[PDB]
Amino acid sequence: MYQDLIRNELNEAAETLANFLKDDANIHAIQRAAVLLADSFKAGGKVLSCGNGGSHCDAMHFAEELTGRYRENRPGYPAIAISDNDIFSRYVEAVGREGDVLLGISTSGNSANVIKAIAAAREKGMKVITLTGKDGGKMAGTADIEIRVPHFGYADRIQEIHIKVIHILIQLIEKEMVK
Template identity: 35%
Template sequence: MNERDYITNLVERYPKLKLCAEDIFSAYETIKSAYLQKHKLLIAGNGGSAADAEHISGELMKSFKLKRPLPKSLVEKLIQIHPEKGAYLSKTLEMPLTAIPLLGNDALNTAYINDVGGPGFFAQQLLGLGNVGDVFLGISTSGNSEDVLYAAVLAKAMDMKVIALTGDNGGKIKQLADVAVCVPETETFMIQELHLPVYHCLCLMLEKYFFD
């Protein structure tokens, strides 16, 4: 399969997504371009979308469907440093595509909320972890989540690309996004039900390109 075949397969299984098929492909090209230049993906969302952010990271940071062996040069260094543990690592580690959900630093997030207040905690993490050329993926079923919007504004100011994964009308984040994937549903849980196959498709295409 080539990258377009994954989109075709996605639309066959979820015909509603034909409306945003080209946006899905554009999101893939945006993330692929960043990875080719040794940049990374940073992801934020609330509630179920927070779980989606971690799900995406899990699919990208290790093998999804394809094997991702370590490069020979790294294997040789590992074994040179410690033959036993290096051999174990060389057989068990899998090459990642760097994807960071802006969720896990409870100390930072609670300190920000306590000391500063307001919905800027995703932006604070993004400021510390993001760089020019990275991609920010903001997931919001309404497109209007304030903490995601603040992070998107900062991402633009930092010369990062912004991808929005949202619902039917796109909400406010659509205007900030370089690419907006607006799945054609308006009910929150139905939007989330379509988000999963969309980001699985993105992960499959990225893995195919870098590891096939």
């Protein structure tokens, strides 16, 4: 008997996923994003990814997967995950290049680092794709493409959707690359 709590949480999960999936704007973001990353690689850009906490892993998986597939007969690295307040932005200034992208992940919409990164990303002439949650905090509308998770509680429920997105993104990029 914590059976309630458990079933509960998982319920919240199915809710949020359900809420996430009904809104068409969500489903579009995902598509344009997959498209934009993809174009970027073909034009030989890389994507810098970052996020805090639980979100940092999501940002690694993202880049490891992509670098896993596209390193072959291509220079540099396709994806790099910002190895962790100015910690993601100094890296952006360190290596970012016009035409590269910046995938910042913040469940809350409020992460100082990601906001500084985003700023340094605009300075470098880089496109910005964010993975957010709640009202999309202070980052709300700074991104070339926000994929926002209609959850208003703890990060949990947002992260979980984040990872599915990151997953589906990898697939969509693939079918874009083989094309």
